[PDB]
Amino acid sequence: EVNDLLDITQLQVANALMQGVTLSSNLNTNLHSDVDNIDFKSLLGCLGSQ
Amino acid sequence: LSDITLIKAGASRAIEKVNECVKSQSPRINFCGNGNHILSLVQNAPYGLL
């Protein structure tokens, strides 16, 4: 029961992180890691397809 | 005695849901439901609420 509480806790955390987020399919984070002198190279890692 | 704490947490969550979703209309975001939320109703389910 404790481990199932942990499992549904992790799934609530993951659904809070992942509800309502569309994405660009052509998002290449090694090409896109900056917007207006703000450094998103260290913030968000690799993403895309390749 | 440990499970009454989870029932009291669910009681406080349904009290705040009764107050700000059903019994009034809250300007808060991502609390009732999941986001993209409209309103709520209530119904005495066994040993809880629905």
Swiss-Prot record, chain A:
Function, as annotated: Mediates fusion of the virion and cellular membranes by acting as a class I viral fusion protein. Under the current model, the protein has at least three conformational states: pre-fusion native state, pre-hairpin intermediate state, and post-fusion hairpin state. During viral and target cell membrane fusion, the coiled coil regions (heptad repeats) assume a trimer-of-hairpins structure, positioning the fusion peptide in close proximity to the C-terminal region of the ectodomain.
Name this polypeptide is given: Spike protein S2
Upper classification of the organism: Viruses, Riboviria, Orthornavirae, Pisuviricota, Pisoniviricetes
Name of the coding gene: S
